[PDB]
Symmetry: C3
C-alpha cells in the first residue's frame, strides 16, 4: 500500500464553490499526496493516471447561452506555468444535467501541482454523492 494516491470529493457543505476534500469513507490522500490551496501536490517524479468528474445541474434554460467547462491543469514546480492537460466544454441549453469526465496518463515531477477547475460553481451538483471527484495514482 505504498503508491502515491488520491481520490478527493467536492465538499457537500461548501456553497457555490468547488472545494476538494479527503474523506474517511471511500476517499484517499495517501503515500505523500497532499491537498494544498485546493490542488493535489505530487510527492515524487513518475507516471500518473489523473482523472476528474463534475456534474452540472440547472433548473431551466436562461436568456444567455451557457457554456460549462471542466479542466485539469498542471502547475510545474520548476516554472510556475499552468498548462491544460485535459478539458471539455458542454452547452446544456440550445431541470438539466451535464456530467463531464476527464482522464489521462502524464509524466509529472515532484512538487508539481494539479488543479481540477470549473467556470460555473453556481451550477455544480456537489450535494449528491459520487458525482464530483478528482484523483491520481502513481503507475
Amino acid at each position: 500500500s505504498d503508491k502515491p494516491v488520491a481520490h478527493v470529493v467536492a465538499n457537500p457543505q461548501a456553497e457555490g464553490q468547488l472545494q476538494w476534500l479527503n474523506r474517511r469513507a471511500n476517499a484517499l490522500l495517501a503515500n505523500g499526496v497532499e491537498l494544498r490551496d485546493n490542488q493535489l501536490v505530487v510527492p515524487s517524479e513518475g507516471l500518473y493516471l489523473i482523472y476528474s468528474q463534475v456534474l452540472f445541474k440547472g433548473q431551466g434554460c436562461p436568456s444567455t447561452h451557457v457554456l460549462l467547462t471542466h479542466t485539469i491543469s498542471r502547475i510545474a514546480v520548476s516554472y510556475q506555468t499552468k498548462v491544460n492537460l485535459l478539458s471539455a466544454i458542454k452547452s446544456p441549453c440550445q431541470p438539466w444535467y451535464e456530467p463531464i469526465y476527464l482522464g489521462g496518463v502524464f509524466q509529472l515531477e515532484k512538487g508539481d501541482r494539479l488543479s481540477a477547475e470549473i467556470n460555473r460553481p453556481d451550477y455544480l451538483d456537489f450535494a449528491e454523492s459520487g458525482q464530483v471527484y478528482f484523483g491520481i495514482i502513481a503507475l
Copy 2:
C-alpha cells in the same frame, strides 16, 4: 499476468436488463475476480481502478421528463452496507443517445462486491458492441 482484473460486457441477448458477462473475446474475469449475482467480487485487499460505461438510446421524447442514471456501488463484506462510489445523471429530453462513463480509484477489502446499476434498462443500448462495460484492475 497475476493482477486481479475484470472487464465485463452487457449480455447482448438479455432483454430489458443489464446483465454483465465475461466473454472469450476482449473481456476479462481473471486472477480471483468473480461475477456473482451480477456483481464483481474483490479477491484481495488493495487499490483498484474501477470503471463502467452505459449508453442509453430512445426513439423520441415522452410526455414525462426522463432522468437516466448510472452508478457504481460498494457492498462491504464487513457491514453489508451499499455505498455510492461513482454516479451521474442525464436528462435526454428538454432518436437520442446518452452515454455515461464513470471511473475512479478506491481502497477495497477482500470479499467486497461492486455493482454497476442503471434505472432505465428499457433504454439500455446493449445490442451494439463496445457501448456497455464494467471493469476493475488491482493497482
Copy 3:
C-alpha cells in the same frame, strides 16, 4: 520509467482530420509504443489501460439528424481483424459541444494495433488544447 506508455493528442494544425501526434510537452510515446499509420502499436503482450476523448463542436443544427461516434478498435497481428473495444454515439441536435470519453482494460498481444476513430472530422474541435487525446499504459 520502463512501462510501455502513450498519450497522444490531435494535431491542432491538421485540417478536417483526426491526426494523432506525440508532443514534447505533456504527451508520451515511450518504452516501445509506436505511432504507425495513425495507430498505436503494442510492443509487448499484457494488460493495458486504453483511453481516448474527442470533442465535437458545431455552429448550429443542420437539416439532417447528425450522429457522432468515437471508437477504439483492436487490430490483432495474428489475424488482421479489426474489433470494436470501446465506443459511444451522440446526437447533438434534436454552437453545440459533444465530448466523448472511452476507457477500459484489455489483454493485448505484441504487434497488435489500436485505432481511435470518429465519423465527422469536420466537427472535431482539435484546435483547443486538452480536448482530443488517445492513450495506453501497460499495467
